[PDB]
Write a protein that binds this DNA or RNA. Structure first.
Length: 98
DNA sequence: GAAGCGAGCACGGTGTTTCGTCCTTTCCACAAGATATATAAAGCCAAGAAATCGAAATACTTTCAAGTTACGGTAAGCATAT
């Protein structure tokens, strides 16, 4: 069965109290009866730290370098930027060049 | 003239070849092997065609990468009001 949007709060609370070291013990203490890899996929999907925020000036240097070095015509492989630049996903990373 | 000095030819050898069996075949022959045929019940071997199932190819599903429409909220420098 899927989540009910009622375990992520306790999940992240216990993970912050323990330090995100051993998810197995966190999953066992939360009492979800599912594998750690099954609840972590939803925790990291509801987590907010995955995204980034307003763009600085120094990162524009890297963004322009990764373009002058492996860009191709009108298409920019933003996946390479996501691989090199951490925090930036694929969806909203296109606005950095649009 | 018969005793002292140089004398043929029958004879006695190997070695080489010839000749003439005994050899095992090729070939042939008289007596007798299935060789045709009649079953017949049994189970198994074994060389051809027809139905069935495994593999996979090209096809369509389906799912996963890209991304640009449409969309909702804040921040700066010029214009304008009493």
């Amino acid at each position: 069965q899927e989540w009910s949007r009622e375990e992520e709060e306790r999940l992240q609370a216990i993970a912050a109290a323990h330090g995100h070291l051993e998810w197995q013990k966190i999953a066992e203490e939360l009492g979800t009866s599912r594998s750690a890899f099954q609840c972590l996929q939803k925790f990291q999907q509801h987590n907010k730290a995955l995204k980034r925020k307003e763009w600085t000036e120094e990162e524009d240097r890297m963004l322009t370098q990764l373009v002058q070095e492996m860009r191709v015509g009108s298409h920019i492989p933003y996946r390479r930027i996501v691989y090199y630049m951490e925090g930036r996903d694929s969806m909203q990373l296109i606005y950095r060049w649009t």
